[PDB]
Symmetry: D2
Subunit: 481 residues, 4 copies
């Protein structure tokens, strides 16, 4: 009922106005503003019905309420603020939101204009999670931000650095027992870090990496007791990984003893092992891992990793485990120099080159799978041709996915390792390689082809100069092998 | 098995020794001390059986372990510490403790010598209630202190100021959600304040009063959700009351706006009302309440209290409510001067002296009850005489209790009020009093007698000089009434 | 040279622009922004000449620079900021400022618009007084604010609460050795409190009173070593006094143990005694001193004050000393009730009413002086009439000043004291009074007249209702005396 | 006067006792303890004469005073404490101390027993350098510790970690202006770090390295204004250097961006350049510099250093400058691998191997000097033989000093560099070397000899295993050169 709705908003806006006036005017007592406050509370509650029709979100904007509500977030009393937050949550709830086409956009825009996020942060900075009500408020705020994020992610960057990111770190860092709020915070932080480098940089600046390490480290020598705790842990790990997609952060991770903590996680063999592995991989990946690569060997990483290379936890699937391990190995071979490189190579000569044997075993495994996949793909293509279905970029994407699933990346890594290993002028290794290859009649040629293919697509999101360099380097392995 | 037990202690003490040695010696790695730690943990666990025979608490003292265990509270790693704490708890548990006669005393003495409490405090000061294990540790420590307190309360004073009291305040003050630990802390603090003035003084010094007020004030505009929360609230109130038994603390309470907070609690009419009333009473009681008395009237206390005097919450029993109200009134009449006294008196002239009528109604009610009680007592005495049972001090105590239950104190207060009221040179009041008295044929004489009796026993725990003064003052009321 | 000047501003504004651009663009190195910074520094220095012609302050506003400069206060590097501050100081310097008529107004307005003060505060909040350069910056900022204050004091209120006031308190409170900066801060704070109640309230809120007490208390048991230290002390005292002109602050002073500290200062007899006296007077003055009055007697103030009443430090002049003492006495007589009033009165009965004798001595002294002054005034009036000079409000003001100097206020106070004293139903006092009066043939009548006059002008800056009440009260003294 | 002296100590000890008693007993007022305090103060002052005869330091120990005085450091009031400190200073003053043989030892022992240092630290932790008196106290304490350190340096280790070291860092870190106290602190800290590894480790643990860097960095972009500031800077540098003698600290220095800060100091060319150079050298020296070596090249250290290698600041002497530069180069050649090694080598091929030319120039310079020195030494030896003076270890030490002064170390470094350079399989370099050598007829042989000599004495303070390894390595250079 549209006229009625309109009337109702004015019902609040005046109340909103007058009660402010009351606050301003008569000297500071309960009685002279007090009864206003109850009125305010109840109107807000009533308005919670308003979220059923977002066809009517052209309204709230319309004259006065948007700014007024925002202004109310700083109210001298928490119960107004929390009510406001609640309203926003109901009002902002995506799941009831995503129907309305104009209704969504305007409100969000208004919020952005009013720098809603900053106000929310400010409000938070005065809450007290001892008081159940207040605690609910925090949760509500978090929910609201999640909702906003889902609708329009361009505000993520200014949302963080409106102080939100700094608040999140503080809440994580707080020596409080685990509760839903912490989990929510973790979730939000993770979301904030999805594909956004500015946010990552901000986190790095704020000593966020240190915080992440510390929070994580609990699960080194303990083990989440619940789905909730576990979920939180996972979120944290994800956040860390996201942060690591950025070079500056490699160094921060290094400084914060990230490498040591992940190696301890591996040694411990608790649940965090898989995540730790992933983190390690992320730390080491490109040129920008070199220092991390070198340090890993220094802290005896080789002793932790090669057992994992050799046998994969009876108990994340096996492929993933293999993928990460091999990835790490590849990284090490790319980047390592001096004594650490020598150390690495030595692990390919013990014990009668058993690791080379392992590598070749792996290669055959992956190769067979790849072949199978390839055949299937070919068949599909043929079928498409028969049916006159044109193969476009979506089709190619789909095909790529299949290959990925079969293990393309792992295979590529293996091939790379093999190439680098046979370029070490260590006869024993080379002989073992070639011996093994013809002996079962797979061929150098296949390996070469694979290498070439890998080179072709290397470096997806980086300077063209880089790509050509890397490709060239990889090709150079083929000369002496 | 006693020899076996002996053997077992050495099994630990060496382990305790050697592992320290290990820690000292080989540069700081996991492996060189690490495996020791598991051994240490397990031995401690095993020892937890030892608490079945306290006939064997002459042992642990005996050679080495007591000091060693204490030293272990500061171990570089929390898991040792927590284990130790657990052991202590099992070891110290009263309920399994109070059988052994020598066994109890020695261990406790040893602990005292080693200033166990300080060490515990230190340990606490490095815990992290984010980690469930650590949180358990805190609880365990609290339990241990409770146990110790129950056995030998002479250590309370040095227990507090071994930093324990300061720690407790901090934990209460912490803006964390409510959990068992908070409740435990509250309980412990309350216990610490039982009949011990040094502790109270310490609390006052530490801004403890402020802390207590702040924690309390939540329940002004909210209302405990659980038995646990409610219990905590009650504990807090008790602590506050205990603190208030000491003059210096009156002033701190005043400064901290205690009076205002309790008046708001009264006005609010939530659960905290009864407790608030009690607190108010405690604030106002003697000469040392004068300032509080005067301030109460200043913040319009009279408006809050006289309604409670007039009608007692339909919904602590009625007698208690009446007792506290009348007590407050008595205090006010004793202490109030200047304009506030005038204000107070005015409340006895409206509306046609309705409050005097109320007072006389109350007096008759209490008087009848007292008479009934007295008759019963007389009967009992007679019976005793018949049976040849000699009435001793226990008997008199018992009799006193009966009188207390019937309402002696309230009656006394009422009488005092009546006397002071009729000494105000306000004819209207006096006429109302005397009119009422003969009209129903109870008598001035009875009232006088009551007053005399009150005077007789006044000031239980205070200077003899004071008592004689107060008594004299009270008698002086009888001249002109 | 006006065109040249114009050219010069553009010379900066571009540099200002481009260097920001540089900062924005090339990844964070010295070299790529670094050389810009030197250019920036030097241009600013050059501009320092610009403050010779404020006839050219219509310019800087004109296009770009005002906002740009403000924006530069938050520069990532302190040396820019400090340069900017320096420029502002040179640019804002009153003494070279107050000539230009339009030139002044526009710049100041611009600054206000840009909320210069907030920016300055922010800048301060990142300084480091270890570094001499930075320390100079603080001083410069202080100077600038002083300058601004002198020109347009309407910004004082938002200047404070732009955080400036809070910063000042922090700097005062800092446990650093005494230096010019502290002195400057003190000066500024004092200025801020001149005739501005909002500022006072803010100070009160911020625990400013406590800070002031603490800083002051050093000079209880020590004694400024330099004119600078002494000056600072004086400033602090002034600030305190200013704060005390506001009722809420009475209570804060009370709570902070201000009364105790001033009484200790009196007892100590160091330099701070005069200031302490003044502070005490300010605490006690009106109805709103009642509580302070009562507390003073409680902490044995009477023992400290009556010696000062009796003999005035051989060593602020004597009149001032007398004025303050008598003022305090008057306040006490106005406000005191109960036991404290009795105590006060007792000091007028010892020793054979020697204090009454003292009072009458004082009265005659002041009276003679007043008479002398009055005669002079009359003569002046006569002369004016002869010369045909019309007596207007300025003339009356001038005359009032003369009377004030002669001691009107003190005399009035004395008279008030006498009246209140003779209304105590203490025959001894009354007899002493009247005995003394006729014995030297001055007269009740004169005293009465004086009282009337006092009543006439009482309560200058307060509700008309209040004034009539107070006047009435004062008149009431005349009935029984 | 010995009996008199004895009497005097009792005069205090009772006063010391009784005043404590007074404090204990009568409720907390000025008057009841107050007058005691003045007595206490004056006796202490009087005792200050006692430091003229340390022949009488068998006394103060003797019965009571030592512990009493210590206990007085925690007195409820700073003026007692400061007096005590003053007494200690006078009492402990070395320069008046070092005569007495028994008198010194006993007092110091007593102090140690009473853990004087901890008490002093505690006292400090409650001071307030705003108050001139208090500030003097700090200085006095510092002086006392210096004195104690000079007499018996075995207490340094427990002196630090009695919290003294942590206090020192805090005081350095304090954002206060520069004053004598800071300088004193710097001096003390430096002393504490003289040849004591435990202290260094403690400093490292406490984030001391970070503190040192931060304090230092001021002088990157500024320049001490006074001898005092300069002195402080020097002290800081020394401390840093001392810290760097320990491997763990290399890593802390690295993490704290020490390398970057020293390179900026070099680039800046302010006074701190020499110190920075030294620091760099210390960071890079042995195997334990490898990481630092590698990082230095990463932050473009090569660009900063090789100019210094090439021409030595027109403006520490030239030899020292050369010594440090060459040292750094040597370190780099020892430790560098991978790409950084390549980079380093490239600097020996530009521009037509000008750096090789430079190196050979340097070598000849140093060689001539060495030869001169050697001749002198020979002459001296001959003279000794003639005179029948037996050459012992002192003589050899003396001779070594001469060689050091002439530049042995620098020469050795140069030789090492030459050897490593000619082992790079870079023909151009080798040809340049050998070309140059015979061309002026100095000889490979000499160089070889020098190398051998260097190897002989290498690794002074380290494992014998290490020494043999290093020596072997150095010899290995001689094969291919």
């Amino acid at each position: 009922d549209e006229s009625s709705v309109k009337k109702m908003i004015l019902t609040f806006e005046k109340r909103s106005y007058k009660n402010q006036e009351l606050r301003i005017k008569f000297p500071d007592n309960p009685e002279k503003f007090m009864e206003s406050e109850l009125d305010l509370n109840d109107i807000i509650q009533e308005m919670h019905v308003v979220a059923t029709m977002p066809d009517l979100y052209h309204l709230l904007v319309e004259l006065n309420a948007v700014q007024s509500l925002l202004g109310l977030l700083g109210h001298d009393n928490t119960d107004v603020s929390i009510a406001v937050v609640d309203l926003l949550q109901e009002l902002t709830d995506i799941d009831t939101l995503h129907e309305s086409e104009e209704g969504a956009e305007v409100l969000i825009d208004a919020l952005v204009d009013g720098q809603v996020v900053a106000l929310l942060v400010q409000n938070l900075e005065r809450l007290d999670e001892s008081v159940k009500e207040e605690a609910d408020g925090v949760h509500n705020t978090l929910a609201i931000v999640e909702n906003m994020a889902e609708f329009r992610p361009e505000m993520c960057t200014e949302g963080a650095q409106q102080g939100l990111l700094q608040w999140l770190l503080k809440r994580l860092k707080a020596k409080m027992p685990f509760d839903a709020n912490k989990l929510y915070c973790s979730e939000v932080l993770a979301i904030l870090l999805q594909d956004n480098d500015e946010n990552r940089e901000l986190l790095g600046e704020l000593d966020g990496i240190d915080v992440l390490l510390q929070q994580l480290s609990v699960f080194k020598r303990h083990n989440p007791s619940t789905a909730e705790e576990q979920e939180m842990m996972e979120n944290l790990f994800d956040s860390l990984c996201s942060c690591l997609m950025l070079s500056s952060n490699r160094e921060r991770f290094l400084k914060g003893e990230g490498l040591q903590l992940m190696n301890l996680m591996l040694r411990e063999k608790k649940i965090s092992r898989s995540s730790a592995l992933k983190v390690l991989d992320h730390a080491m990946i490109g040129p920008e891992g070199t220092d991390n690569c070198h340090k890993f060997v220094d802290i005896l990483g080789l002793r932790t990793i090669f057992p994992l290379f050799m046998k994969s936890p009876r108990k994340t699937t096996e492929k993933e485990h293999e993928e990460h391990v091999c990835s790490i190995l590849a990284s090490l071979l790319r980047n390592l120099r001096g004594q650490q490189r020598t150390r690495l190579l030595n692990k390919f000569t013990e014990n009668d080159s058993e690791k080379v044997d392992r590598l070749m075993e792996l290669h055959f495994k992956y190769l067979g799978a790849m072949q199978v996949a390839d055949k299937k793909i070919e068949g599909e293509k043929h079928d498409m041709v028969r049916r006159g279905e044109i193969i476009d970029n979506d089709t190619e994407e789909e095909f790529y996915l299949r290959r990925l699933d079969a293990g393309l990346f792992v295979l590529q890594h293996i091939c790379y390792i093999m190439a680098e290993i046979c370029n070490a002028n260590v006869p024993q290794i080379r002989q073992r390689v070639h011996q093994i290859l013809n002996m079962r009649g797979s061929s150098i040629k296949i390996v070469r082809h694979i290498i070439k293919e890998y080179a072709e697509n290397i470096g997806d999101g980086r300077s063209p100069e880089f790509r050509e360099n890397e490709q060239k380097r990889i090709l150079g392995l083929l000369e002496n092998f």
